[PDB]
Subunit: 312 residues, 2 copies
């Protein structure tokens, strides 16, 4: 049940049960859900809690779109539109777009940068851009992603903050597409559905520098896979990234819907557990002030401390 | 002899001569000096260029004071005075000390955080605090540190911006000592001398989680050493840390005098060279807009990419 192909299992069971209650300290912006899936290169998979419950990727999708953009346009082209620096600000902060002239978004993990990324995906319309993104997604999890239309429609009507960012980006020429078209792509990718298993698989692929261990094929260029991991570590948890690097030490990416995708490169897992590295998928709807899963973050920290996963 | 004890050598020789000329694009504020030293666990060291030229550590000293503060006060006490988050701002920026209430310094690598760290070192006077710092320094490099008096006198006369930071920190109660006392400690630690060999040895110790490979003893608590490495990666190069993580990938710390201390933990090296890890010491007086050695950074990047040092 808890272990299959596609101590640790028991520990995860116990940890999920222990941390679940802390959800009362966070918000969803069912809060008590907590699930996790850990995947190894040989297909070995362990999970606990609400690991098979579907949720929208939200910001986790930013890692995929950034990778897709890099694969299509090449890293140099992407770098001319977005930098790779932490802002020290909230994920949806607009400040630097005006203060840091010319106004290039600081990184592709914050909303501003992710909007620029969405606008540079190949395609003449939102439909083509998304089809390209879905094709990349398909090579990763082996299936065309399903869009949670109810959530998309919900976010589409209340995305005032994101529209502000997009229009400011348009103003300063850091959008390679029309605003509404960009918003559509951005909100649609955020609405792609996933369970902890899917993001654990994407995590595993990145851990192995773009090589898909189950299909035995290089699906993401190594240099691009490496770049994604670096951005996850420095900006993946926004203005909480520093704390995560210091007290967890594993590249991770959150989504305000409560998901967290993390990964551990080979050997950086402690000789005993997951020596060959692993992909990690976590789900905990209750999020903190930074937008990161509260119970999911605590669970990850515990795993990293206990199994010595830190890459530092 | 480019290799001794306390292709790689030939490559470093070649790269130093190649990158040396780029100093014209930066400034010191000798400008063309470029040196490097790489130290391995077995005591084997390789060097090229101006590797044996004495220079002031400047900000590199911040890693040591941070470590000393953690060893003396314990991590919990330190974390109550300074955070571990990137600012997205210049190393000497004062902005967040006012904007982000109550005003805790974001991290110990930026000037503000380092000043707080200096104020919490054990002792009732600048001399007492420094004595302790020098004793820790001695256990690392095996000798009492020498202070560049001329440089200290110069810093002391023109440290207007740093005094501004110190007085603001005092204002918000994030300085556990008197301002002038703290400035003395800060400017003195910055004036401690070293060559690329000394900082490579410190980097080697950190790479091995606080274990001195040549003396065979734990000189820095493992958790403190790991914390320093995390801060180096996220904040060590200030608002260029994101770029370094993305295109170099090894924990690094700069000093405005042109030094760069970097490190590579075991296995996170390739298969060769330096499979067991190494400490890296670099010196390139010409610095960029971020306060980081221009040619030194280029040299570090070339090494990292060529030998695949990235920890991601």
């Amino acid at each position: 049940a808890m272990k299959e192909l596609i101590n640790p299992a028991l520990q995860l069971h116990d940890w999920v049960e222990y941390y679940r209650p802390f959800a009362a300290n966070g918000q969803s912006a069912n809060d008590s859900q907590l699930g996790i899936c850990v995947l190894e290169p040989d297909g070995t998979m362990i999970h606990a809690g609400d690991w098979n419950v579907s949720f929208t990727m939200q910001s986790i999708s930013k890692v995929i779109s950034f990778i897709a953009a890099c694969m299509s346009r090449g890293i140099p082209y992407v770098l001319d539109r977005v930098d790779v620096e932490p802002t020290g600000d909230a994920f949806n902060s607009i400040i630097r777009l005006e203060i840091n002239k010319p106004g290039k978004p600081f990184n592709p993990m914050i909303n501003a940068g992710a909007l620029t990324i969405a606008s540079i995906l190949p395609g003449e319309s939102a439909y083509e851009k998304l089809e390209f993104l879905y094709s990349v997604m398909e090579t990763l999890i082996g299936k065309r992603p399903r869009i949670h239309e109810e959530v998309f429609r919900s976010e589409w009507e209340t995305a005032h903050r994101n529209r502000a960012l997009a229009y400011y980006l348009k103003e300063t020429n850091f959008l390679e597409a029309e605003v509404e078209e960009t918003l559509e792509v951005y909100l649609k990718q955020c609405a792609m559905e996933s369970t902890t298993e899917d993001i654990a698989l994407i995590g595993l692929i990145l851990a192995h520098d773009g090589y898909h261990p189950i299909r035995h094929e290089q699906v993401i260029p190594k240099d691009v896979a490496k770049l994604a991991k670096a951005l996850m570590l420095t900006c993946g948890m926004y203005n909480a990234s520093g704390k995560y690097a210091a007290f967890v030490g594993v590249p991770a990416k959150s989504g305000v819907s409560g998901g967290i995708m993390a990964l551990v490169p080979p050997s950086a897992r402690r000789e005993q557990p997951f020596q060959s590295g692993c992909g990690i998928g976590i789900y905990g709807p209750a999020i903190d002030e930074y937008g990161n899963s509260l119970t999911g973050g605590m669970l990850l920290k515990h795993m990293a401390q206990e199994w010595e996963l830190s890459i530092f």
